[PDB]
């Protein structure tokens, strides 16, 4: 793939959510370029590179029971970027929780994620 | 106000949508700092400053019948930023249209919008 088209960004972002939802860590890491950054939550310092990104996703998804689903359409650009709204379900002390998130991503000229920025704060959490 | 808190970002972003929805242009322009930028759609060159921003909103809302509403919660940060999903209804040739959008905004230390980035592409449009 080259720089993704708006159509392709929709596909890729949607794919990312599918991989979070099944909790496939190596497949998630494979979406990222070599030396990609992740800011999650946006406002924290970026993590760098596929090893740090893998560790991050292990700390998040290595329970195996997280679920994630789009809660509206991917909004894509013509310059290989997009933003999407989703909800993550997690169990955080035998208590179900939900977190509402918006990811902004920028893709490189090979279709890998170059930057990911996950917008959310503690009030987007619902312990329920 | 100072740099907005996550709570305050929610309020401000929500307010912005309310002002779009009633089509109040001077109130929208007053939310922006002096020398704020707007990228709408993200991928296009930024417009600069309160006069260009006013002209932009006039070209968008000076029919008076556009409507806008959040389609999920504002996701806020602890560094005066947030992102929100919304839908804009417009009539574009006597034909109702809807556009799905995600705005990312960064606020300054006075609570004014410093940058606004509106993520959307033509496939987020529905002529219906």
From Swiss-Prot, chains A, B:
SUPFAM superfamilies registered for this protein in UniProt: NTF2-like
Phenotype for residue 103 to N: Reduces activity 4-fold. Reduces activity 10000-fold
InterPro entries: Ketosteroid_isomerase (IPR039256), NTF2-like_dom_sf (IPR032710), SnoaL-like (IPR037401)
Assembly notes: Homodimer.
Membrane-spanning parts: none
Inducers of expression: By steroids.
Key words, A-Z: Isomerase, Lipid metabolism, Steroid metabolism
Residues the entry annotates as binding substrate: 103
Protein name: Steroid Delta-isomerase
GO molecular function, a single term: steroid Delta-isomerase activity
Gene3D superfamilies recorded: 3.10.450.50
Originating species: Pseudomonas putida (Arthrobacter siderocapsulatus)
GO terms, biological process: steroid metabolic process
């Amino acid at each position: 793939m080259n720089l993704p088209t708006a159509q392709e960004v929709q596909g890729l972002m949607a794919r990312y959510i599918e991989l979070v939802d099944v909790g496939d860590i190596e497949a998630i890491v494979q979406m990222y370029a070599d030396d990609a950054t992740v800011e999650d939550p946006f406002g924290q310092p970026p993590i760098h590179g596929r090893e740090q990104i893998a560790a991050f996703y292990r700390q998040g998804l290595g329970g195996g029971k997280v679920r994630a689903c789009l809660t509206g359409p991917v909004r894509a650009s013509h310059n290989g970027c997009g933003a999407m709204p989703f909800r993550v379900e997690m169990v955080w002390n035998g208590q179900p929780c939900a977190l509402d998130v918006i990811d902004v991503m920028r893709f490189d000229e090979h279709g890998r994620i170059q930057t990911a920025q996950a917008y959310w704060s503690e009030v987007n959490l619902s312990v329920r």
